[PDB]
Amino acid sequence: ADLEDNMETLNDNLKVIEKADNAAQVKDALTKMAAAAADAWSATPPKLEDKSPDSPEMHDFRHGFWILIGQIHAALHLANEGKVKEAQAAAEQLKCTCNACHQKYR
Amino acid sequence: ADLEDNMETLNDNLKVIEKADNAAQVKDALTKMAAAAADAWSATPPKLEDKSPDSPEMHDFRHGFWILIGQIHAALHLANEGKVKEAQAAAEQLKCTCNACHQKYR
Amino acid sequence: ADLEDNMETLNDNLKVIEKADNAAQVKDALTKMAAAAADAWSATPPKLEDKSPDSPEMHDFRHGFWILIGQIHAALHLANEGKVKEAQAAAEQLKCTCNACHQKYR
Amino acid sequence: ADLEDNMETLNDNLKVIEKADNAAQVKDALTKMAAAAADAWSATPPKLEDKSPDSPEMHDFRHGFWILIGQIHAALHLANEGKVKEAQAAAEQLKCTCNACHQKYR
Ligand code: HEC
Ligand code: HEC
Ligand code: HEC
Ligand code: HEC
Ligand SMILES: [Cu+2]
Ligand SMILES: [Cu+2]
Numbered sequence A, B, C, D: 001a002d003l004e005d006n007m008e009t010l011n012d013n014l015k016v017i018e019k020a021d022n023a024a025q026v027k028d029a030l031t032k033m034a035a036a037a038a039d040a041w042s043a044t045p046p047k048l049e050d051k052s053p054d055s056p057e058m059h060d061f062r063h064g065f066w067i068l069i070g071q072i073h074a075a076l077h078l079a080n081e082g083k084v085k086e087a088q089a090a091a092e093q094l095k096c097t098c099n100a101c102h103q104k105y106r
Helices: A003-018 A024-041 A056-079 A084-092 A095-105 B003-018 B023-039 B056-079 B084-093 B095-105 C003-019 C023-040 C056-079 C087-093 C096-105 D003-017 D023-042 D056-061 D063-080 D084-091 D095-105
Strands: none
Touching: A003 A024, A003 A084, A024 A056, A024 A084, A024 B023, A056 A084, A056 A095, A056 B056, A056 C056, A056 D063, A056 D095, A084 C087, A095 D056, A095 D063, B003 B023, B003 B084, B023 B056, B023 B084, B056 B084, B056 B095, B056 C056, B056 C096, B056 D063, B084 B095, B084 D084, B095 C056, C003 C023, C003 C087, C023 C056, C023 C087, C023 D023, C056 C087, C056 C096, C056 D023, C056 D063, D003 D023, D003 D084, D023 D063, D023 D084, D056 D063, D056 D095, D063 D084, D063 D095
C-alpha cells in the first residue's frame, strides 16, 4: 500500500487483537500486520526525505520495523501455542516500539 | 494456504533470491516467503496428526516457523538496507532451518 | 561447563525468577539463564553424540538454544521497562522451549 | 556495572571476532558481547538522565540492544553450526546497529 495506509492497517488489527474472540482472530491480525509491516519497512517517511537511505537514521527507522516484526511473530508463537491472553498481551506490550518510532520519526 | 503450496512458494522464492539482481526481488521475494511460512505456522503436518496439537512435538514444530521466519526477516533487514547479495547469503543459510524440519516432521 | 550443569543453572535461575521481587533481581537470572544457554549452545548431549555436527539433527538441537535466548531477551526486554510480572510471565511460556527439546533429545 | 565500560567490551570483542580463524574465538567473543549488551540495556545513558523509564526515548534506546543480541546470537547460530566465514562475515554487519544507536542517543 503506502506508508500512511500501512500504519492504519496496524492500528486496526491491534485493537482487533485486544478485542480478540478466539485464537484465529489474533492469528489473523498478527498475519495482516507483519504483512502490513514489510510494506512500511521499505518506505521513506516524511521527516527523513532528507537523510540518505544509507543513513544511520534510515537503518534505524528501518530497524524499528525489524523489531516490530520480531514482536509480532513472537505474538504468533503464543497464538499458535493455544494461549491468547498471553499473545494478546505481547500485542499490547508492543506499543513500546510503536511510540518509540513515532517519537523519533513522525 | 495448504502446506505443500506454502512450501512451494517458499522453495520458489528461495530460487528467486538465489537468482536475484537487486534490492527489490530479494525484498519482494522474502516478503512473499514471510506470509508463506507465516501461514504454514498453524497448518498441520501429517506425521504429527497422532500428537496432540498442544504437544511438545507440535510446539517444536511450530517453533521452527518462529525461526525460519526470522532468518527471513533478518535477511529482509539487509535486503531493506541495500545489502543485496548478503541478503542472498542470508537466504542460503536459512536452509539449515527448512531441512531441520523435513528431518523430523516430513 | 558441560551439559547437565548449563541446564540446572538454566533451571535454578528459573525458580529464582518466578519468586523474585524486583526487575533487577529478575534481570540478573534472565542474564544467568542466557549466559549459560550460550555455553550450552556448544554442547552435544548423549542422545545426539550419536549423530554428526553437520547433521540437521545437530542443527535443530542448537536451534532451541537460538529460540530460547531469543525469548529470554524478550523476557529481559520487559524487565528493563519496569515490566516484572510480564517478564516473569515470559519466563513461563519460555519453558515450552525447554519442552520442545527435552521431548526430542534428552 | 556502569554502561560506559560495557560499550568498550562490545567494541573490542568485534576486534577479537575479526581476529579469529575458527569457532570458539568467533563463538566466545560474541558470547560476552551479549553479556555486554545485557547489562548496558538497563543503564540510563548520559543523554537521558532527564527522561522517565516509561519514556519513548528510553524504550527505543534500550530496544537497540534488543536487536543487537539478536544480531549477535544470530551470528552465534552460524558460529555453533561451525560456520566461521559466515559468522565473521556476519559479525561485522551488526555494524549498522552499533553506529545506529550512537548517532541517535550517544
Ligand atoms: C525453507 C524455507 C524450505 C523449503 C525450500 C521447503 N520447506 Fe518444507 N515441508 C515440511 C513438511 C513436513 C512437508 C510435507 C508436505 C506434506 O506432507 O504435505 C514440506 C513440504 C515441502 C515441499 C514439497 C512437498 C510436496 O509433496 O510437493 C518442498 C519443496 C518444501 N517443503 C520446501 C517441513 C518444513 C518446515 C517445518 C517447520 C520448515 C520450516 C520448512 N519445511 C521449510 C522449507
Ligand atoms: C529451560 C529453557 C530449560 C530447563 C529449565 C531445562 N532445560 Fe535442558 N536438557 C536438554 C538436554 C539435551 C539434556 C540432557 C541431560 C544430560 O546431559 O544428561 C538436558 C538436561 C536438563 C536437566 C537435568 C540435568 C542432569 O542430568 O543432572 C534439567 C533440570 C533441564 N535440562 C532443565 C535439552 C534442552 C534444550 C535444547 C535446546 C533446551 C532449550 C533446554 N534443555 C532447556 C531447559
Ligand atoms: C518502525 C516505525 C513505525 C512503527 C513501528 C509504527 N509506525 Fe506509525 N508511523 C511511522 C511513520 C514514519 C509515520 C508517519 C508517516 C507519514 O506521515 O507519512 C507513522 C504514523 C502513523 C499514523 C498516521 C497515519 C496517517 O495516515 O496519517 C498512524 C495511524 C500510525 N502511525 C499508527 C501506528 C500504529 C498503530 C503502530 C503500531 C501498530 C505504528 N504506527 C507503528 C512509523 C512507524
Ligand atoms: C542501545 C544503544 C546502543 C547500542 C546498540 C550501542 N551503543 Fe555504544 N553507546 C551508547 C551510549 C548511550 C554510549 C555512551 C556511553 C557512556 O558514556 O555512558 C555509547 C558509547 C559507545 C562508545 C564510547 C565509550 C565511551 O566511554 O564513551 C563506544 C566505543 C561504543 N559505544 C561502541 C559501540 C559498539 C561497537 C556498539 C555495537 C556492538 C555499540 N556501541 C552499540 C549506546 C549504544
Ligand atoms: Cu520494548
Ligand atoms: Cu541493520
